[PDB]
From TrEMBL, chain A:
Disulfide bonds join C154-C210. This is Ig-like domain-containing protein. Residues 133-226 form the Ig-like domain. It is found in: Cell membrane; Secreted. It comes from Homo sapiens (Human). The chain holds residues 143 to 242 of 472 of the full protein. The gene is DKFZp686P15220.
Automatic annotation (TrEMBL), chain B:
The chain holds residues 126 to 289 of 565 of the full protein. Glycans are attached at N17, N51. This is Hemagglutinin HA1 chain. It comes from the Viruses.
Automatic annotation (TrEMBL), chain C:
The gene is IGK@. One of its GO terms (cellular component) is extracellular region. The chain holds residues 128 to 232 of 236 of the full protein. Immunoglobulins are composed of two identical heavy chains and two identical light chains; disulfide-linked. This is IGK@ protein. Disulfide bonds join C136-C196. GO terms for biological process: adaptive immune response. Keywords: Adaptive immunity, Disulfide bond, Immunity, Immunoglobulin, Immunoglobulin domain, Signal. Residues 115-212 form the Ig-like domain.
Length: 227, 164, 212, 109
C-alpha cells in the first residue's frame, strides 16, 4: 500500500553538502504536495521544506539559505539538497504527503493535513570523526557491599559516532541494568554511562564482565568491574 | 487583424479572500502540474468561498473578449471540499447578456483522468459595456482577456505543409 | 508570527483515564488547517486529527478533537498503554509557514517515589590524562523533577551537570539520572571533599554523598 | 454501457413529465426527480416538471424523446431517481451516402 521510503547518508563536514532521496509507492505522486520535517537529536518536530505539485518550494527562515527541494514525478521520488550544512542541522529527517493538488478528480480525498509518513534517515555534522570508545570501570575496595547501598558501573567516555551497545555476560543480566542515553560533551565525542545494582555479598562468586560494542571503528572492550 | 492580451482580473490583487493557487496534473508542463494562463482557479480558503461580484468596465474602446469557465465536480464531497457550499451558482452579465450556471455532480467517464469537468464559455464586451460576475462557488474566473481590433483578409487553414 | 503554544509542558496520568491536552496559537487559526500528531516513542510520527474535528483514516475513537479560533483540544477517553506518546499540534495550510511545535509529554506517573543516591572516585585510566570527570547517580524515582548541585568544599556550578535522564521502565515506571561534574586537574588535586547533593521533593531532607 | 461494437451506437432514451402532482409521487415515489445522461463528450441533466397540458392522444402528461451517438470506445452512463424512459434496443449503424428521405405516394414495383 501507501509508503514513503527515505534514503541518504549520515556523516558530513561542518559546511558540507548532502542529498536525500524519497521513494514513494502505493498512490499517485504527481497530485500530492510533499515536505521534509526534521526531529532534532533531542526532540521537537520542525518543518524545513515543502514543494507543491506545481513545483513551488517554500522554506522556513531557519533553512531558507542552503536547502533546496526537487521532484521526479517520473521516478516517483522527491529530493532535498542540503548545502553549506550548519551545526544544529543534525537529526532525523522525515518525508510527508499533504493536500491533493486542487484539480485531482474527486476520488482521493482533499484535506489540509499530512498523512503518509516515512521511517526517516539520520544526518549529523563532523568535528573529528571516527574515534573508538574508552571504557574504565571501578577497581577493588570501594564504599559498602550491601543490599541497599548497591550500584557499580563502567564509563564509555570519548567515542564518535553513535551507537554503542552495552553487554553484561553476552546477554545474561535481564534485570536491574540501567543503560543511560549517549550524550555529546563539549568539543565533540558522545559519552554514555551504564550502571548495574549488585547483590549484598556477591563480590566474588561470579564476576560480571563489562562488554562494549562499537560498530563504526570496530572496537570491542572487555575491561570488567572489580573481580 | 490584431488584439492585445491583458490581465482583466490580476491574481495577486483581485482575489483577496479566495485561494487562487488552483492547479491540475491534467494541465502538465515539463513534469510539474499547471493550468490555463488566460484562465484562473478560485477555491475556498479558511472558512468558505464567500460571495463575489467582480466587475470590469470596457475602457479599451475595442471589443474585449472575456473567457470564463464553470467547474462541475464528480463527487458530492469534492464539491463541499473545494467550494464549502453544496448548492452553488455562477452568474455572468453584460448590458445585453445574461446566464445562470448551476454546476451538478456527475461521475462521468475519465477523459484525461478526470471524472469531473470544466465547461468553457465566452463573450465579447462591447466598448462601454460592463461584465459582472456573481458566484458562491465553482467559478473558473478569467485572468487575461483579449481586446481585439478585427479586419478580414484572415482565416483558419488546416495544413501539414511547412512555413518558409 | 503564528506560534502554536502547547499546554501543559508535561502530562502524566494512570491508564483507563481521560486526558485533555490544549493548543493555543498567537492569532486565530480558522480550524480547517489545525491537526494533531502522535509521536509514538522510538518511531515515525502519525496523524490522528485534521481540520480540527476529523479522525484519522485508521485511528481509535478514544481520541476526540475540537476547538475554534485560538483554543483547541485533543481528548483521549480510553488512555490505554499505547496512548503514552509525546503528541504535537501542527498548523498545516495556506500560509506557507507550517508553524508546528508542541510539548504535552503524556507519560505514566501514578504512585509517589523518592531517589536513591551514589558517588564514584576517579579511576586509574581517566587520571592518566590528568582530566577528571566525576560521576553521580539517582536511580529509580516516579516524580521526574530533580535538582543536582555539587559541593567542591562549598563551590562549583559551571561545568557541573551533564544530566542523562532515562525513560520510564516497562515494570517500575521510574526514572534514573547521571549528572557528570567535568573539570581540570587545577582544582582536582587541590581539594579534599567532593559532594553530590540531591535536592528532590520526594526525599524529606536534601541528602548528600561525598568522598576523599 | 461500453461501446464494444466498433461502430457508432445510436442510443435513444426518454424523460417523462407527468400532468398531476400525485401521479409523479405514485409511479416514481419521489416528488423531486433527476435524469442524467453522459458520454465522454456529452452531458445533460433533466428535471421533469408537472404540467396539466392540453390532451394530445388523451394525454395531459408527456414524454420528451432524446438521442445520442456513442462513438466506438465511449461509455454511456444513466443516473436517475425517477421519470426515466430507459432504452431497451439500440442501433449500431455503419453509414454510407447514396441514401436519403423521399416523400412519395407512388407504389413500389
Ligand atoms: C450571499 O448571497 C446570498 C444570495 O445568493 C445571500 O442570501 C440571502 O440573504 C438575505 C439576507 O438579507 C436573506 O434575506 C432575508 O429574508 C427573510 C425572509 O423572511 C427576511 O425576514 C430577512 O430580513 C432577510 O431579508 C435571503 O433569504 C438570503 N437568500 C437565501 C436563498 O438564503 C447571502 O446573504 C449573501 N451573503 C452575504 C454575506 O451577504
Ligand atoms: C471578500 O472579498 C470581496 C471581494 O474583494 C469583498 O467584497 C466586497 O464587499 C463590499 C462590502 O463590504 C462590497 O461593497 C463590494 O462590492 C465587495 N466586492 C465585490 C467585488 O463585489 C469582501 O469584503 C471580502 N471579505 C473579507 C472577509 O475580506
Amino acid at each position: 500500500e501507501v509508503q514513503l521510503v527515505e534514503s541518504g547518508g549520515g556523516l558530513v563536514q561542518p559546511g558540507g553538502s548532502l542529498r536525500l532521496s524519497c521513494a514513494a509507492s502505493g498512490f499517485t505522486f504527481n497530485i500530492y504536495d510533499m515536505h521534509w520535517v526534521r526531529q532534532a537529536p533531542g526532540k521537537g518536530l520542525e518543518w524545513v521544506s515543502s514543494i507543491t505539485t506545481a513545483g513551488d518550494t517554500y522554506y522556513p527562515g531557519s533553512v531558507k539559505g542552503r536547502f533546496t527541494t526537487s521532484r521526479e514525478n517520473a521516478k516517483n521520488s522527491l529530493y532535498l539538497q542540503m548545502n553549506s550544512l550548519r551545526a544544529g542541522d543534525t537529526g532525523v529527517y522525515y518525508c510527508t504527503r499533504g493536500v491533493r493538488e486542487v484539480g485531482a478528480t474527486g476520488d482521493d480525498p482533499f484535506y489540509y493535513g499530512m498523512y503518509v509518513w516515512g521511517q526517516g534517515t539520520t544526518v549529523t555534522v563532523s568535528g573529528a570523526s571516527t574515534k573508538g570508545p574508552s571504557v574504565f570501570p571501578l577497581a577493588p575496595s570501594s564504599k559498602s557491599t550491601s543490599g541497599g547501598t548497591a550500584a557499580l558501573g563502567c564509563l564509555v567516555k570519548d567515542y564518535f559516532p553513535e551507537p554503542v551497545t552495552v553487554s553484561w555476560n553476552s546477554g545474561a543480566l535481564t534485570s536491574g541494568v540501567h543503560t543511560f542515553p549517549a550524550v555529546l560533551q563539549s568539543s565533540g565525542l558522545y559519552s554514555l554511562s551504564s550502571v548495574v545494582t549488585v547483590p549484598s555479598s556477591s563480590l566474588g562468586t561470579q564476576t560480571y564482565i563489562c562488554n562494549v560494542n562499537h560498530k563504526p571503528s570496530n572496537t570491542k572492550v572487555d575491561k570488567r568491574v572489580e573481580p | 487583424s490584431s488584439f492585445e492580451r491583458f490581465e482583466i482580473f490580476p491574481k495577486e490583487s483581485s482575489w483577496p479572500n479566495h485561494t487562487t493557487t488552483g492547479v491540475s496534473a491534467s494541465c502538465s508542463h515539463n513534469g510539474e502540474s499547471s493550468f490555463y494562463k488566460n484562465l484562473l482557479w478560485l477555491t475556498g480558503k479558511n472558512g468558505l468561498y464567500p460571495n463575489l461580484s467582480k466587475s470590469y468596465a470596457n475602457n479599451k474602446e475595442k471589443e474585449v473578449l472575456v473567457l470564463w469557465g464553470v467547474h462541475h465536480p464528480p463527487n458530492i464531497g469534492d464539491q463541499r471540499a473545494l467550494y464549502h457550499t453544496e448548492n452553488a451558482y455562477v452568474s455572468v452579465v453584460s448590458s445585453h447578456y445574461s446566464r445562470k450556471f448551476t454546476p451538478e455532480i456527475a461521475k462521468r467517464p475519465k477523459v484525461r483522468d478526470r471524472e469531473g469537468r470544466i465547461n468553457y464559455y465566452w463573450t465579447l464586451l462591447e466598448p462601454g459595456d460592463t461584465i459582472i460576475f456573481e458566484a458562491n462557488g465553482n467559478l473558473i474566473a478569467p485572468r487575461y482577456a483579449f481586446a481585439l481590433s478585427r479586419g478580414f483578409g484572415s482565416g483558419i487553414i488546416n495544413s501539414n505543409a511547412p512555413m518558409d | 508570527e503564528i506560534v502554536l503554544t502547547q499546554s501543559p509542558g508535561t502530562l502524566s496520568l494512570s491508564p483507563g483515564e481521560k486526558a485533555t491536552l490544549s493548543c493555543r496559537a498567537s492569532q486565530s487559526v480558522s480550524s480547517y488547517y489545525l491537526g494533531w500528531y502522535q509521536q509514538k516513542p522510538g518511531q515515525a510520527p502519525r496523524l490522528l486529527i485534521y481540520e480540527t474535528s476529523r479522525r484519522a483514516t485508521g485511528i481509535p475513537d478514544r481520541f476526540s478533537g475540537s476547538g475554534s479560533g485560538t483554543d483547541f483540544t485533543l481528548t483521549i477517553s480510553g488512555l490505554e498503554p499505547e496512548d503514552f506518546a509525546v503528541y504535537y499540534c501542527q498548523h498545516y495550510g495556506v500560509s506557507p509557514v507550517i508553524t508546528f511545535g508542541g510539548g504535552t509529554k503524556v507519560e505514566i506517573k501514578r504512585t509517589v517515589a523518592a531517589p536513591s543516591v551514589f558517588i564514584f572516585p576517579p579511576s586509574d585510566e581517566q587520571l592518566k590524562s590528568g582530566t577528571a570527570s566525576v560521576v553521580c547517580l539517582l536511580n529509580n524515582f516516579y516524580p521526574r523533577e530533580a535538582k543536582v548541585q555539587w559541593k567542591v568544599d562549598n563551590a562549583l556550578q559551571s561545568g557541573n551537570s551533564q544530566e542523562s535522564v532515562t525513560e520510564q521502565d516497562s515494570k517500575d515506571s521510574t526514572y534514573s539520572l547521571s549528572s557528570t561534574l567535568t573539570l581540570s586537574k587545577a582544582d582536582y588535586e587541590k581539594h579534599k571533599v567532593y559532594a553530590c547533593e540531591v535536592t528532590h521533593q520526594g526525599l524529606s531532607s536534601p541528602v548528600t554523598k561525598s568522598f576523599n
